[PDB]
Design a binder for these strands. Sequence first.
RNA 1: UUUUUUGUUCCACGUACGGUACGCUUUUAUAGAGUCGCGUUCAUCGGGAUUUGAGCGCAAAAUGUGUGGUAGGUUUCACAU
RNA 2: AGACCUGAAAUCAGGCGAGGUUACCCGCUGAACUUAAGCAUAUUAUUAAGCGGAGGAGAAGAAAAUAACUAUGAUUCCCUUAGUAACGGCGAGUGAACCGGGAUCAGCUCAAAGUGGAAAUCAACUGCUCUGUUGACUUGUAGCCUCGAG
Lengths: 51, 145, 202, 199, 97
Amino acid sequence: NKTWRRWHRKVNVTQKRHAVASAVAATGLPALVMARHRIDEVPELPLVVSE
Amino acid sequence: TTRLRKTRKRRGHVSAGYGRVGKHRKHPGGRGKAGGMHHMRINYDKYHPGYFGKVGMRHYHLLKNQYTCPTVNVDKLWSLVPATLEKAEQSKDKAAVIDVTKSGYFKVLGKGDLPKIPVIVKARFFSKIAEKKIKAAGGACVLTG
Amino acid sequence: GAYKYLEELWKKKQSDVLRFLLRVRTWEYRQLPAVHRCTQSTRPDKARRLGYKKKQGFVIYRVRVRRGDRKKQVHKGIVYGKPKNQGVRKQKSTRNLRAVAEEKVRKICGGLRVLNSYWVGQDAVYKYYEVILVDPAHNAIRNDPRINWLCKPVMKHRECRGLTSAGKKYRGLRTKGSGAARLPSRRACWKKRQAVRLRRYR
Amino acid sequence: VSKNNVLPNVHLHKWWQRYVKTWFNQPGRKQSRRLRRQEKAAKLGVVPSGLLRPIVHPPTQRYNLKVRAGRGFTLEELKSVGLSPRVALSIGVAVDHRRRNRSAESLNANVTRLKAYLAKLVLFQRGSKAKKGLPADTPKSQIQNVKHVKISTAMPIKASKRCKPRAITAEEQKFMAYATLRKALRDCKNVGKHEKKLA
Amino acid sequence: SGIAVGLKRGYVVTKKATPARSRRPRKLSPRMSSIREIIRQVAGFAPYERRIIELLKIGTAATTKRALKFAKKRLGTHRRGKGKREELQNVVSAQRR
RNA sequence: UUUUUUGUUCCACGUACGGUACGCUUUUAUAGAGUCGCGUUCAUCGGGAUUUGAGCGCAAAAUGUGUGGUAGGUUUCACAU
RNA sequence: AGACCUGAAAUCAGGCGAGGUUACCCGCUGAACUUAAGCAUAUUAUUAAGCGGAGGAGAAGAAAAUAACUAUGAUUCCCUUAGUAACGGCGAGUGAACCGGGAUCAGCUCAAAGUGGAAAUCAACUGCUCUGUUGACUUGUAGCCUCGAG
């Protein structure tokens, strides 16, 4: 096993951003959060709190 | 993804995908482009015609930039400078000036067609056809250097 | 000034004045040993120009190098290999005889540090140089600022690494531009282009 | 060689495993540079980092439009403003003794750039008392300098675009800009060929 | 303005006339004549120069041409040779009086 | 250690015997030789009527010399010293 | 007899060199296996082995440079030019540079002149906190000057 084996991937910046948006969308919906946690006592999603 | 390669499935078969008769020998047929002249000639004629021989006069120390010349077409230009278009549609006085150097092209070629709005185009070089098309549009031609 | 008149008539080598005087000197040099000391400069004109200064701890040696080329060093000129390499007689060597002379003067004067060299004459079987040396231990060189740079430990054996005037000519740092594009160093430049550069995002 | 592919053109016949440069240091290199920029600017503090550089057109015809930063100014340019070439590196202006000014336009760009910089420049007293010249001594009035600004970011170089829209004159529609170029080529080839036919 | 191609080409700019620089013409001077005209008497001419000087003392454009052939062989360039016979022509002009 | 900082920290109080700048004008005291260069031989280079080096032979010049990627001459120009 | 010049001697007084280490660095020296489906030019390779020399870095370095533009401006390194121009039984194979964008930025001093109302210079040994006594040195040591001008 040589050291020059290419370890890293460049993913495109647009595909990286679309992904984070899609992942942030799944933060809302208790469908996807319960599917992937314990959301019995939690009043709301997305759970916002003050500054 | 070593997983997905044929060797994994192929494993368990003795030939290993190369065949029992002919075998996976180390270097049949030579190395690299060797044998192009003789044994691999049929492949060269077709696939790669014109490969053997020398044609033109050689240029010592050829330098790019001496010859560089990025070309915009007449069919574009407008993309070059959208507000002016609504200005230069109206008025029938003054004209929207297109310094083609500033976007970063030197020559102008009239492959396309242009709307009939008076305009002035400044470029280092103009194709013969581009000039005829621009004039028809009522545009003017200006040379920079 | 007298040094101007000296350089102007040293240019006239073919003349009867200098060709007599240079025939007598080259006799004297081939009686004496190969590397031996002169107690003052033969050409004070020329040495002054190469940063010789007549104070204590500067010295000056003669050196003699045989003229011509060397054979390739094989037994009975029996080479072993491809007919290109079967070349015993007409070899040349990379380095001029001025630089060889500076080199000869590593063992004989290990402590002394070489500044420069200049031609003092030539003969059919020999060719004679005067090599300007320095004592870096001596306080006259050590105290003064203008040749304190030679007392740093980087400037050891700068004859051997090719950093005199004459050493710097055969490496080809004396030209510069497109001709010398190839040779930081001949080897250093060679290493840079040859390397397979594998950036981490590909 | 079989099938229809490109004829291969690979340069790996030498012992190339010795000279493989890898870039695992790349982030460690970033952060080592970045530590010594900061530890520079600790010592300076008030003093801005680099030094001021001129506006400069690149040479050959394909980068002739563009403008970039140069190396350093010019002995002619500093004479107009009235710096010495001697002192200018203390204030933080590059001198370049090689670069001429062939044009009047490239001169007056960099002179404006220098005069604008010396308007920015506050210069502290060496102490105790104030001392004129050697711009000036600024007194203890002294408007608040921000810390090291970096000098490139303080006074940057923006490809200044735009054209005034123009009336199409007489002798604009008339003159035929193919044939004007196409003369200018075929004159410049046949210069000595003309002077035989003339004489 | 201006044009890309031609004898009168380039971008229109108000040219400055740059100052006199190095590049100061390396003339012979009245001091350094008197250096060399001394050393010409002390040293004298080289053997190759003497043979050129006798070929110009003949005159005659047959053997004057052979001086240029000789002094291109001997100093190895045409520009070097043209300069040398032009100098030693000036020596023969003074010597004849 | 801040004076000797791998580029300058804070207030307090100092000075011109010397030495160095800058402005105008005048200007020739003037710049490295068995070196440059060329002819040949051998190596080296992508460098091809020679990229760079070396040996041998020849061996310079002062409005000069070197370079301007084809050998050569005449006439200009540019860039370096 | 006395001035120099040249060359020796000394267990003389006080100093300096040698050898070791291998990752990187500088200089010489110098192959063949191998590829070309043979082979000799070519390739491997201006590499391995050999012989020298260093340092925390080394070498390089302020143009006898690129260019032919509205011009640039020490050196090194990265990206790009570019698998391009070019080399090559023009076969196999080989193969840079300028411009451009970055890291980093720093410039300088000797020879060529001029103390000649006056060797102003340097070392060694001794002596108080910088004098004295020998020597080096005019076959040139200080100051001044380095083309950006002087």
